[PDB]
Amino acid sequence: RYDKNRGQVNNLAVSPTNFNLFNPVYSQKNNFFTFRTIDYERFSINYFP
Amino acid sequence: GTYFETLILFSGNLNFSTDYPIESISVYENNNIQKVYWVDGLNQARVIN
C-alpha cells in the first residue's frame, strides 16, 4: 500500500480513492527461475549425428 | 559377417502391384528414428520406421 493515509488519527476524508491504494508488483513469486519434473523412462533424444 | 539378419517388418495387404514398382528415400535422424519413405505410382505415399 503506497498511500500515506495510514495510522493517522484524523481519518476524516479517507475513501477508496485515498486510503487503500495498492501496488500489486510487490506480490511477486520466484517466477523467473522455474523448474519441473522429468520422466526417466521417457525417450527424448539427445544425439544429433 | 556371413549372413543377413532378416526381419519381417510387415506381412499384410498393402495394395502393391508389379506394374508399379517402388522408389524410396530413407533418412537417419538418430538410432531409433530411421525412416524409409516410399511411393508407388498407384497408391498413397507411405513411411516405415
JSON list of C-alpha atoms in Angstrom, two decimals:
[
{"chain": "A", "resi": 1, "resn": "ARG", "atom": "CA", "xyz": [0.00, 0.00, 0.00]},
{"chain": "A", "resi": 2, "resn": "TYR", "atom": "CA", "xyz": [1.65, 3.18, -1.29]},
{"chain": "A", "resi": 3, "resn": "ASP", "atom": "CA", "xyz": [-0.67, 5.87, 0.13]},
{"chain": "A", "resi": 4, "resn": "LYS", "atom": "CA", "xyz": [0.35, 7.96, 3.14]},
{"chain": "A", "resi": 5, "resn": "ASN", "atom": "CA", "xyz": [-3.06, 7.98, 4.88]},
{"chain": "A", "resi": 6, "resn": "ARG", "atom": "CA", "xyz": [-2.02, 5.18, 7.24]},
{"chain": "A", "resi": 7, "resn": "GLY", "atom": "CA", "xyz": [-2.21, 5.24, 11.02]},
{"chain": "A", "resi": 8, "resn": "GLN", "atom": "CA", "xyz": [-3.44, 8.83, 11.36]},
{"chain": "A", "resi": 9, "resn": "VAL", "atom": "CA", "xyz": [-5.96, 9.91, 13.98]},
{"chain": "A", "resi": 10, "resn": "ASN", "atom": "CA", "xyz": [-7.88, 12.19, 11.60]},
{"chain": "A", "resi": 11, "resn": "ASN", "atom": "CA", "xyz": [-9.17, 9.61, 9.06]},
{"chain": "A", "resi": 12, "resn": "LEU", "atom": "CA", "xyz": [-11.91, 12.10, 8.13]},
{"chain": "A", "resi": 13, "resn": "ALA", "atom": "CA", "xyz": [-11.57, 12.42, 4.34]},
{"chain": "A", "resi": 14, "resn": "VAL", "atom": "CA", "xyz": [-10.43, 8.84, 3.68]},
{"chain": "A", "resi": 15, "resn": "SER", "atom": "CA", "xyz": [-12.19, 6.88, 0.95]},
{"chain": "A", "resi": 16, "resn": "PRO", "atom": "CA", "xyz": [-11.43, 4.06, -1.52]},
{"chain": "A", "resi": 17, "resn": "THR", "atom": "CA", "xyz": [-9.75, 6.77, -3.61]},
{"chain": "A", "resi": 18, "resn": "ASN", "atom": "CA", "xyz": [-7.22, 7.65, -0.87]},
{"chain": "A", "resi": 19, "resn": "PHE", "atom": "CA", "xyz": [-6.98, 5.00, 1.83]},
{"chain": "A", "resi": 20, "resn": "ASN", "atom": "CA", "xyz": [-6.06, 1.62, 0.31]},
{"chain": "A", "resi": 21, "resn": "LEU", "atom": "CA", "xyz": [-4.25, 2.30, -2.95]},
{"chain": "A", "resi": 22, "resn": "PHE", "atom": "CA", "xyz": [-2.22, -0.79, -3.82]},
{"chain": "A", "resi": 23, "resn": "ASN", "atom": "CA", "xyz": [0.86, -1.62, -5.90]},
{"chain": "A", "resi": 24, "resn": "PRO", "atom": "CA", "xyz": [0.50, -5.28, -6.99]},
{"chain": "A", "resi": 25, "resn": "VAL", "atom": "CA", "xyz": [4.13, -5.68, -8.11]},
{"chain": "A", "resi": 26, "resn": "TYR", "atom": "CA", "xyz": [5.43, -6.48, -4.62]},
{"chain": "A", "resi": 27, "resn": "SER", "atom": "CA", "xyz": [3.35, -9.69, -4.54]},
{"chain": "A", "resi": 28, "resn": "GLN", "atom": "CA", "xyz": [5.70, -11.44, -6.97]},
{"chain": "A", "resi": 29, "resn": "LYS", "atom": "CA", "xyz": [6.89, -15.05, -6.78]},
{"chain": "A", "resi": 30, "resn": "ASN", "atom": "CA", "xyz": [10.14, -16.74, -7.84]},
{"chain": "A", "resi": 31, "resn": "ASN", "atom": "CA", "xyz": [8.74, -16.99, -11.35]},
{"chain": "A", "resi": 32, "resn": "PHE", "atom": "CA", "xyz": [11.93, -16.21, -13.29]},
{"chain": "A", "resi": 33, "resn": "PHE", "atom": "CA", "xyz": [13.81, -19.43, -12.43]},
{"chain": "A", "resi": 34, "resn": "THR", "atom": "CA", "xyz": [11.23, -22.22, -12.53]},
{"chain": "A", "resi": 35, "resn": "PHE", "atom": "CA", "xyz": [11.80, -25.97, -12.89]},
{"chain": "A", "resi": 36, "resn": "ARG", "atom": "CA", "xyz": [9.76, -29.14, -13.34]},
{"chain": "A", "resi": 37, "resn": "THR", "atom": "CA", "xyz": [9.98, -32.91, -13.01]},
{"chain": "A", "resi": 38, "resn": "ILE", "atom": "CA", "xyz": [11.42, -35.15, -15.75]},
{"chain": "A", "resi": 39, "resn": "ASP", "atom": "CA", "xyz": [10.40, -38.73, -16.55]},
{"chain": "A", "resi": 40, "resn": "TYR", "atom": "CA", "xyz": [13.27, -41.22, -16.54]},
{"chain": "A", "resi": 41, "resn": "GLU", "atom": "CA", "xyz": [11.83, -43.88, -18.85]},
{"chain": "A", "resi": 42, "resn": "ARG", "atom": "CA", "xyz": [10.51, -41.42, -21.44]},
{"chain": "A", "resi": 43, "resn": "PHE", "atom": "CA", "xyz": [12.61, -41.42, -24.61]},
{"chain": "A", "resi": 44, "resn": "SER", "atom": "CA", "xyz": [13.72, -37.90, -25.54]},
{"chain": "A", "resi": 45, "resn": "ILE", "atom": "CA", "xyz": [16.63, -37.99, -27.95]},
{"chain": "A", "resi": 46, "resn": "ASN", "atom": "CA", "xyz": [19.99, -36.40, -27.17]},
{"chain": "A", "resi": 47, "resn": "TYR", "atom": "CA", "xyz": [22.02, -37.48, -30.24]},
{"chain": "A", "resi": 48, "resn": "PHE", "atom": "CA", "xyz": [22.29, -35.37, -33.41]},
{"chain": "A", "resi": 49, "resn": "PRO", "atom": "CA", "xyz": [24.51, -37.13, -35.98]},
{"chain": "B", "resi": 1, "resn": "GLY", "atom": "CA", "xyz": [29.76, -61.43, -41.08]},
{"chain": "B", "resi": 2, "resn": "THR", "atom": "CA", "xyz": [28.40, -64.26, -43.23]},
{"chain": "B", "resi": 3, "resn": "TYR", "atom": "CA", "xyz": [24.59, -63.94, -43.19]},
{"chain": "B", "resi": 4, "resn": "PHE", "atom": "CA", "xyz": [21.75, -61.43, -43.45]},
{"chain": "B", "resi": 5, "resn": "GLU", "atom": "CA", "xyz": [19.86, -60.99, -40.18]},
{"chain": "B", "resi": 6, "resn": "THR", "atom": "CA", "xyz": [16.41, -60.88, -41.76]},
{"chain": "B", "resi": 7, "resn": "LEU", "atom": "CA", "xyz": [13.34, -59.43, -40.04]},
{"chain": "B", "resi": 8, "resn": "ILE", "atom": "CA", "xyz": [9.78, -59.28, -41.37]},
{"chain": "B", "resi": 9, "resn": "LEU", "atom": "CA", "xyz": [8.59, -55.77, -40.56]},
{"chain": "B", "resi": 10, "resn": "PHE", "atom": "CA", "xyz": [5.13, -56.40, -42.03]},
{"chain": "B", "resi": 11, "resn": "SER", "atom": "CA", "xyz": [3.06, -59.05, -43.79]},
{"chain": "B", "resi": 12, "resn": "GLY", "atom": "CA", "xyz": [-0.36, -57.94, -44.99]},
{"chain": "B", "resi": 13, "resn": "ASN", "atom": "CA", "xyz": [-2.34, -56.35, -47.81]},
{"chain": "B", "resi": 14, "resn": "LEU", "atom": "CA", "xyz": [-0.57, -53.01, -48.55]},
{"chain": "B", "resi": 15, "resn": "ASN", "atom": "CA", "xyz": [-2.09, -52.86, -52.04]},
{"chain": "B", "resi": 16, "resn": "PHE", "atom": "CA", "xyz": [1.06, -53.46, -54.20]},
{"chain": "B", "resi": 17, "resn": "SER", "atom": "CA", "xyz": [1.28, -54.20, -57.96]},
{"chain": "B", "resi": 18, "resn": "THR", "atom": "CA", "xyz": [4.15, -55.39, -60.12]},
{"chain": "B", "resi": 19, "resn": "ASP", "atom": "CA", "xyz": [3.23, -52.77, -62.73]},
{"chain": "B", "resi": 20, "resn": "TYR", "atom": "CA", "xyz": [4.02, -50.05, -60.13]},
{"chain": "B", "resi": 21, "resn": "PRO", "atom": "CA", "xyz": [7.46, -50.71, -58.58]},
{"chain": "B", "resi": 22, "resn": "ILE", "atom": "CA", "xyz": [8.81, -48.86, -55.54]},
{"chain": "B", "resi": 23, "resn": "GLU", "atom": "CA", "xyz": [11.01, -45.77, -55.27]},
{"chain": "B", "resi": 24, "resn": "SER", "atom": "CA", "xyz": [12.32, -44.83, -51.83]},
{"chain": "B", "resi": 25, "resn": "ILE", "atom": "CA", "xyz": [14.18, -42.23, -49.78]},
{"chain": "B", "resi": 26, "resn": "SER", "atom": "CA", "xyz": [15.49, -43.20, -46.34]},
{"chain": "B", "resi": 27, "resn": "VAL", "atom": "CA", "xyz": [16.83, -40.83, -43.67]},
{"chain": "B", "resi": 28, "resn": "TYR", "atom": "CA", "xyz": [18.86, -41.37, -40.50]},
{"chain": "B", "resi": 29, "resn": "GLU", "atom": "CA", "xyz": [17.85, -38.92, -37.77]},
{"chain": "B", "resi": 30, "resn": "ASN", "atom": "CA", "xyz": [19.08, -40.98, -34.80]},
{"chain": "B", "resi": 31, "resn": "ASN", "atom": "CA", "xyz": [19.45, -44.54, -33.52]},
{"chain": "B", "resi": 32, "resn": "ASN", "atom": "CA", "xyz": [15.66, -45.04, -33.23]},
{"chain": "B", "resi": 33, "resn": "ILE", "atom": "CA", "xyz": [14.12, -42.77, -35.90]},
{"chain": "B", "resi": 34, "resn": "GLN", "atom": "CA", "xyz": [15.32, -44.42, -39.13]},
{"chain": "B", "resi": 35, "resn": "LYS", "atom": "CA", "xyz": [12.58, -43.86, -41.69]},
{"chain": "B", "resi": 36, "resn": "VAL", "atom": "CA", "xyz": [12.04, -45.09, -45.24]},
{"chain": "B", "resi": 37, "resn": "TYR", "atom": "CA", "xyz": [9.65, -43.02, -47.35]},
{"chain": "B", "resi": 38, "resn": "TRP", "atom": "CA", "xyz": [8.46, -44.85, -50.46]},
{"chain": "B", "resi": 39, "resn": "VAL", "atom": "CA", "xyz": [5.89, -44.24, -53.18]},
{"chain": "B", "resi": 40, "resn": "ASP", "atom": "CA", "xyz": [4.12, -46.25, -55.85]},
{"chain": "B", "resi": 41, "resn": "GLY", "atom": "CA", "xyz": [2.69, -44.68, -58.96]},
{"chain": "B", "resi": 42, "resn": "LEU", "atom": "CA", "xyz": [-0.69, -46.03, -57.82]},
{"chain": "B", "resi": 43, "resn": "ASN", "atom": "CA", "xyz": [-1.05, -45.78, -54.03]},
{"chain": "B", "resi": 44, "resn": "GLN", "atom": "CA", "xyz": [-0.56, -43.17, -51.33]},
{"chain": "B", "resi": 45, "resn": "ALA", "atom": "CA", "xyz": [2.91, -42.24, -50.18]},
{"chain": "B", "resi": 46, "resn": "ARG", "atom": "CA", "xyz": [3.91, -44.19, -47.07]},
{"chain": "B", "resi": 47, "resn": "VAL", "atom": "CA", "xyz": [6.51, -44.24, -44.29]},
{"chain": "B", "resi": 48, "resn": "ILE", "atom": "CA", "xyz": [8.09, -47.02, -42.23]},
{"chain": "B", "resi": 49, "resn": "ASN", "atom": "CA", "xyz": [10.43, -46.86, -39.24]}
]
